[PDB]
Subunit: 283 residues, 2 copies
Amino acid sequence: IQDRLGSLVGQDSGYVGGLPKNVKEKLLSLKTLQSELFEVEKEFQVEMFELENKFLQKYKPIWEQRSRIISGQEQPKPEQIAKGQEIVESLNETELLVDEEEQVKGIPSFWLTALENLPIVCDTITDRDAEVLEYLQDIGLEYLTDGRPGFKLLFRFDSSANPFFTNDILCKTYFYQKELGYSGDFIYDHAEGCEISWKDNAHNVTVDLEMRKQTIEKITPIESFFNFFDPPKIQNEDQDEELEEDLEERLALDYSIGEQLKDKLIPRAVDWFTGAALEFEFE
Amino acid sequence: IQDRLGSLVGQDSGYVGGLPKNVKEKLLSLKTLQSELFEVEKEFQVEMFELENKFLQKYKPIWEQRSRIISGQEQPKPEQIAKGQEIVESLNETELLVDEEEQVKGIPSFWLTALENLPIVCDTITDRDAEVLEYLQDIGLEYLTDGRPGFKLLFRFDSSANPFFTNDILCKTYFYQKELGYSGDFIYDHAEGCEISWKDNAHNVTVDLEMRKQTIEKITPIESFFNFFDPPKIQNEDQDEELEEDLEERLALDYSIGEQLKDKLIPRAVDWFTGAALEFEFE
């Protein structure tokens, strides 16, 4: 509240300011003991990040399974099919129930549909790029072990049928800073955008093509979802205004989005498709 | 927003409702694959809770050290004393600086002072019980390994000088439910209050004593901080109103508080004393 810290921290920093040499000293050492804790808390975070990658491994198999179901590449074993009905009824998701258990292949626009129902990331998609997101085959995680910690998002596309770009995978990379938060956990530092190979300038969803004659073309940067693969410029000399406040919050959102896919979308993709996810959260 | 889920989840649960038998089925299995993930995610939480207890161990030593510094039981080694000054300047906490490094013993009302500057928990303290909190020697953590997971808060008091109660330690116990959240982590379930042995009915801060004659005394339950050691009644048949909404949020706060001590106060007690903590967070 800018004030609840100008007045509060004020008297506080004052009270302490007035304490005896004697007492003051004790705190000085307490402040030292704090930095010791800190050194431990760093190791903690390390074994945690590891422990996490450990289970990412145990999930991958499952997520790949669904990747294939959605692809239409693998079919549902009746056994699974039933359990789902049982589960779905249990969760009162009746819209999913189907009669006497045993058209299209797999489940169309799963990722497009799921992302629509996802907060912040639905406002980045445009009809223009929603067409391109038709070809999004799966989205995956990967923690950066070798080197500075961070994670990565892997958008595997239908290379063999994708009209806009020949790429097989587009990823996103986030790097936390070595320094830990006061809170005690990793802090966002830098983000890298796994470039895109649009076959056509026209097919380039991130840009606008209006051709004139003097049939030369004029290109114009559009606001697209695929701009996610071109994070905001590496930290600039803060100081200034719109050269900061502006290109600074574009980043804040970019970090926020990546965290949504990493924490909600990927772990519960089915539900984000059904919209069930949205609710399951308020509950 | 109650509506952004009545209209949203509505069309969503509808779209899905209209999908083909074919497609519907796929999701039914996806829904099955989800419950598999779930079984893994439980193990994850387990190795995590463990990993956490592992480091709690590595912290204990340090925290005990400060416990003693605050007690006045152990003195600050000049080496620590300096580092603190170095640290404090570095963090621009000048009020802590003291001149030529080498009255009262240790550092008085450390825990009382720290708790004051702590959100929600400062509103529970009353002049009445702030006197009793003068004797609070330390506050500690402990994860429940043997059995259902949860944690515990250990308030060690100055038994040898405490006027109000003879107890050596008052604790608080929180038990998470075996079932995990949709979010993926532990959920609050039940809270236990480590009883208090007030020497005097008068000294009983949690109650009010107004003696009349007919010199018999009349007792009246006051709103105290030490009520924290008598959590809200074990889950009652929800249904009703103030017998619910009322004694339900008294709980919500009680769980919230315990999480504040566990996550902020204990890990950064020095700062909560200086008030530095408050700020270090907005930053």
